[PDB]
Symmetry: D2
C-alpha cells in the first residue's frame, strides 16, 4: 500500500596522502575556513531536500563524525552511520548502504566536495525530481584527467564516460554528487573491481548510460565546484569561502540555516542551537537569522 530519496555521504580514508595534517583527524573533519569539511556536502544534500542520510567513514573516524553531528535530530535530520573497513572504491557505498537504501531512491555525495552558486537549489531539485534513472553533473575543469570525464556528441548528448583517462575526450568532469533510482544497488552488486582494484562509480554511471537512463546536466561555469584534494587546494577553498562570507555577512553551507529555511526546524529550535554558540560569530549569526529577512 502507498500513501522519497535518501542520502549517502562517503567520508572515507584519504590514506596517508595529506599527512601529517590528517594524522590528528580525518580529512572530512578538517575545517574549510570556519566549519568542518563535512558541513559542505551535508548542506548540499539538505538543499536537495534530503533528510535521511548515511555517513560512511572508517571504523576509527565513525565516532568522531558521530560526536560532531549526532543523529541529526537537532537539525531535523535522521543521520545514520556505517563503517567502511577498507578504501575499495566509491561504488562500495551502495553495498555498505544497501539496507539503508532499501527500496528508495538515493543520492551520493563525496565528503570533500564543495559547491557554491546561484539557484543551486533549483539545479539539485531538477536532479532529485527525475524519479527514474540516474542524474549526474558535468563541470568544465582544467585537469579532467583527475576525474570521471564525459564525452558529448555535437547535439550535446552524453556518449561516453571514462575514469581518469590519461587522454581525456573533453574538459567535462563528472562532479562527486550523484542521484540514483532503485536500480543502483543491483548494478553495484554486479561490478567487478577495476584494474587498480576499486569498485568504480564511473562503471555504475556507464550502466545507466548504456540503458539510456543517465541524465548529464551541465553545472555551469557560474558555479564554483572546489577541490579539497591537496593542502594547496584545501587552502584555496578556505580563502574562497572566507571572501564570500566576509563580503556578504552570510554563511555558505551553514546546516542550521538550511534546516531553518527548509522549515525542518522552527525559530525556537534555531534559538536553542544558537545559545551554546552565543559567544562566537557563528552562534551570533544563527541568532541574527531569527530576526533578519534574507532573500
Amino acid at each position: 500500500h502507498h500513501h522519497k530519496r535518501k542520502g549517502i555521504i562517503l567520508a572515507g580514508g584519504s590514506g596517508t596522502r595529506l599527512h601529517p595534517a590528517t594524522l590528528a583527524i580525518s580529512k572530512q573533519l578538517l575545517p574549510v575556513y570556519d566549519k568542518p569539511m563535512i558541513y559542505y556536502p551535508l548542506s548540499t544534500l539538505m538543499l536537495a531536500g534530503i533528510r535521511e542520510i548515511l555517513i560512511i567513514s572508517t571504523p576509527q573516524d565513525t565516532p568522531r563524525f558521530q560526536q560532531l553531528l549526532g543523529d541529526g535530530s537537532n537539525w531535523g535530520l535522521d543521520l545514520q552511520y556505517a563503517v567502511q573497513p577498507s578504501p575499495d572504491g566509491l561504488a562500495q557505498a551502495f553495498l555498505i548502504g544497501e539496507s539503508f537504501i532499501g527500496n528508495d531512491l538515493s543520492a551520493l555525495v563525496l565528503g570533500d566536495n564543495l559547491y557554491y552558486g546561484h539557484d543551486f537549489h533549483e539545479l539539485l531539485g531538477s536532479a532529485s525530481q527525475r524519479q527514474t534513472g540516474a542524474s549526474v553533473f558535468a563541470y568544465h575543469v582544467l585537469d579532467p584527467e583527475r576525474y570521471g570525464v564525459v564525452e558529448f556528441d555535437q547535439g550535446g548528448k552524453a556518449i561516453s564516460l571514462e575514469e581518469k583517462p590519461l587522454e581525456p575526450k573533453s574538459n567535462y568532469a563528472v562532479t562527486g554528487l550523484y542521484f540514483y533510482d532503485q536500480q543502483v544497488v543491483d548494478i553495484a552488486r554486479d561490478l567487478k573491481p577495476s584494474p587498480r582494484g576499486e569498485l568504480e562509480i564511473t562503471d555504475v554511471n556507464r550502466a545507466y548510460l548504456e540503458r539510456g537512463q543517465l541524465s548529464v546536466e551541465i553545472m555551469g561555469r557560474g558555479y564554483a565546484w572546489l577541490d579539497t584534494g591537496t593542502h594547496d587546494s584545501l587552502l584555496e577553498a578556505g580563502q574562497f569561502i572566507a571572501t564570500l562570507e566576509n563580503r556578504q555577512g552570510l554563511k555558505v553551507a551553514c546546516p542550521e540555516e538550511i534546516a531553518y529555511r527548509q522549515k525542518w526546524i522552527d525559530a525556537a529550535q534555531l534559538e536553542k542551537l544558537a545559545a551554546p554558540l552565543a559567544k562566537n560569530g557563528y552562534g551570533q549569526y544563527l541568532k541574527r537569522l531569527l530576526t533578519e529577512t534574507v532573500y
Copy 2:
C-alpha cells in the same frame, strides 16, 4: 520614423586613497589577477548586450584607457570616451554623457565593480528588457554603511534608499550597476549637490522610486559581488578570480570571449586577436575557444 541601450563605465579618479600603487596608473587600470580591472565591468555591460559604451575618466587617464581598449571595433563594440575634470559625484556621468545618451536608454556601471555567477546573463537581461523606469540590484553585505542601502517593507517592496547611512535600515546594498530609461538625464539635471558636494546616484534612484518607477531586483547570495575599494580587497578579488580560472580552465570576464559568444565577432576575427597573444596563456585560451564547445 521608427524601424536600444547605451552603456557608461565611470572609471574616475580614486584620488590618493590607494597611493602609492595608483601614482603609476589609475585604479581601473590595475589588474585583478590577469586582466585590467576595467575588463570586468566592460564584460558586464557586454553580457547585457550593450555594444555602444562611453568611458568616463580623468583627462590624464583617458589616453591610457584609449591605448588599452581603442574604439572597441576589434571586439564588435563602439567605445567612446569623455573626460571628468573633477570627482563631483557619480550622477555627473549623465551630464557628461548627455549627448552620448541622446534619446536612448542607458546603463551605468562603476569601473571597479566585479560580478560573478550563474545566469548572470539572465539577471542582466531582465533589467535591460524593462524599457521604462529604472532597475537596480540589491545585494546582502556585511558593511552596508559604505553603500546606497535599500529598505524593503514586509511584502518585499522597496520603500527607502539612503546614501551611506551611519545606521543602515537593512544589509542590502545597491550594487554599482544601474539601468535607466530616457528620464535619467532630466532627473540628473535637477540634482543639487549633497552635503559633501557630490551629485549622488542615490538621489537619481530615489526620484525613480518616488514616481513608482524603480525596480529593485535581488542579486542573490549565490552571486559574488566583489569589492576593489582597498588594497586588501583588491587582493581578495585577485585570489577569487585566480581560484575560479585555475579550477575551470575558463576565464571570467574575457571580453573577446564575450563578443564571440554574443556573435559580435566571428571565428576568423577571434583568431586574429589570438595571434599577437599566442605566446601567453591568454592568447592560447582564445585559440582554444575556436575549437572547444563550452556550455
Copy 3:
C-alpha cells in the same frame, strides 16, 4: 639544563564549529598540525624535555598523536589544565615537571619564522638567571602584553591588554625562566579578569630588574593563530615559503635530525610510512641533500 612547556589551552567556543570535537592546536597550518610549530620552536632552542599542557578533552588527543616523543629524540610528558584560568597556571600544573630546572614556555598557537632564529633563542636560553622575553612591533598592541621603553631602550612597564597601550611592542608567546618562576606564580593573586596572568609573572621579574626584553626584529615573522582569518593567513604564509624553497618550516623530524637527536637510520624509518606523500619524500630527500 632547560625544560619546556607548550600551553595548548582551551579556546572555549570561539572557533566553533571547526573546533567541535577537534582540538584547536591539532588544526593544520598548511600541511602540518598547529602544535608542530611551537614544538619545533622549543626543539630549535635545544629543548628536548617538554610538557604539553592542554584541556581534559584535548590532552589525550595530543598523546595519541605524539606519544612520548622517543621517535624524534624527545622526552614528552602531558598534563591537564581543568579550566582556562590563565597562562601562569602552567607553572603550578607544571611544578613537579620543572623541578629545580630552568624552563621555557611557549603558546600552542604561536608561529615564528626567520633568519638566525636559532641564535635569538640560543641567546635567551644561555642566560641562566632572570627571565627572557621578546618584544615584537605590532598593529594592534591592545590584544597583548605591551612593553613600554624609556628613551634609552630599557623596559619600564608591562601591561596586559591595555585600553591605551604605551607602545606598539607586544610581548611574544615565548618565555624563558630561571628557578624563581614557580614561587612567583604560586604567590600570584588572580587579576580582575579572573586569570593568573603571564604578564604578572613577567612584571615580577621586571620589578626585580631581572627581565631581559629583546627585540624580535621586523625581519622575523611572528604569526598568531587565534581566529579563522589568522589561521588562514598563516597557512598561506607557510605554503608560499615552502613551495618557493622546496624546504619546510617547523618540520620536527628535520629539526631533531639537524640537532643530532635522531640519526639517518631513524629518520629513514620515519620517512617510510609517509613515503607515498610529499612529507615522507621530503624526509627521504633530507638524507642525501646538503642544505645550508
Copy 4:
C-alpha cells in the same frame, strides 16, 4: 663607492593583458609599485646613485613616477634597453654610468625580506674585489642560474637553466661587481638562446676564483614576480607581514629617512600629499615613533 642598476626589462607579452599599455614593474605588489622593492633593496645596501634600465616604452613611465630621486635623497638616472637581449647588456648600456666605480645589479621583479638583510648586503658591498652573489635553496632550480657546490661548500659550476640541475641552489637576482664587469660583458659572445647571460659574467669571475657565493638562508624570503600567480602570492605575503606588524616592507621614504639621506622636515613634506591615506599616515607616524 658603489653605483646600482635596476634592470626593469621587457616581459614581452607574457603578462598580457595586464601589461598592455602598463609597465610590468609598475604593477603593484600589495600597496606599492613593484619597483619600490628592488629600489629599497639597493637603498638598504647603502647605494644612492642608481640607473633604471627599462624598455623604450616603459623608461619614461619610471621617469615620470620617480624623477631624479632627489626627494628621497637619491641620484636616479635612466637608460633604455631597445631589445630584451640578455641581462648582461645592463653593463654595456650602463658602461658610462658605472664609469670606473664598483657596481650592484638588481632585477626589477625581485623581492627580498628578512632579518639582518642589511648586514648580508653590507658584507657583499664591502668586498671591493671580485663579485658577490647569493645562492638560495628553491623547488624549481631549472628556471634559474644554478650553483654546484663541492663537499667542502665551494662553488664549482654555474649553469643557466639546466635541464638537469646539479643542485637546488638558485643564484638570486642581486649581484655585486668590481671594475672588471664592463670588460667581461664586452667580451661576451651571445648564448645559443640569443642572450648576453648574467651567468656567463658570473662564471667568468668564478673561473678567475673571484666569485663569492654566499648562502641566502631559508629564513630569508626571496620572492619572484614573474607570473600572475607569483605576483599574487607576493602581495599576500607582504600584506600579511604589514597588517601584522603595522610596519612596511620596502617603503623607500622610510629607508632614506633611516639612512639619514632625508631628514624629518623632508619626510614630513613627503607625508603631506599622502596624508589622507594610510601610506602618508605611516610616514607621519615614523617622525614620532621609535622603531627598533
